[PDB]
């Protein structure tokens, strides 16, 4: 993955399709259109220009990247789907000079 | 070099001389950084993040001095509660995301 392209791929949470943002700035993970189900703890995540309230989710499946990994996921109103540092590194990913 | 992500990939570089400690983002577009006053030709913009919009004002050839990298960039400045190089520096650097 060169810089000259933004980073979006195609991910499959719990089967539903959704194109993410492979952000390394950012600590967790928060996504938009999911339904995942009634077993969340409420959280307030926080980043330029204010507040977003999101739904926590742990231990979730996903597949990007032809990988196939478990993880913590948060769902809420972005304006961007974003998949942070939690999700890359237990993938493996690394950022090279 | 190489940053694992396991903790959060952070540098020191120098905008046109002064130091300031820096995040590399590999989802944002343009760079924004907090508490520098430089001389270069500038136009006030309106950047909005995942939280909502902030005030700033954009500088053109700006130089800057990034693990022993030189490069002449656009760059913003305002209130932002994280300092941040976006993708339009790191692509003049060479960087990029290894799997
Ligand atoms: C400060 C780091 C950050 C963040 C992301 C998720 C949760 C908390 C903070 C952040 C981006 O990485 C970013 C990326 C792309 C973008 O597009 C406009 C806007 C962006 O706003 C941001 O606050």
Redesign the interface.
């Known amino acids: 993955?060169?810089?000259?392209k933004?980073?979006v791929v195609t991910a499959y949470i719990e089967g539903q399709p959704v194109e993410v943002?492979?952000?390394?700035?950012?600590?967790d993970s928060?996504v938009a259109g999911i339904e995942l189900g009634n077993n969340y703890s409420p959280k307030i995540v926080?980043?330029?220009?204010?507040?977003?309230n999101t739904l926590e989710y742990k231990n979730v499946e996903i597949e990007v990247?032809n990988k196939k990994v478990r993880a913590t996921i948060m769902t809420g109103d972005?304006?961007?789907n974003?998949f942070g540092?939690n999700i890359?590194?237990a993938?493996?990913?690394?950022?090279?000079?």
Do not use: H
């Open positions: 993955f060169s810089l000259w933004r980073p943002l492979l952000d390394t700035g950012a600590d928060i926080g980043g330029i220009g204010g507040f977003i990247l972005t304006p961007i974003i540092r890359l590194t993938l493996g990913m690394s950022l090279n000079l």
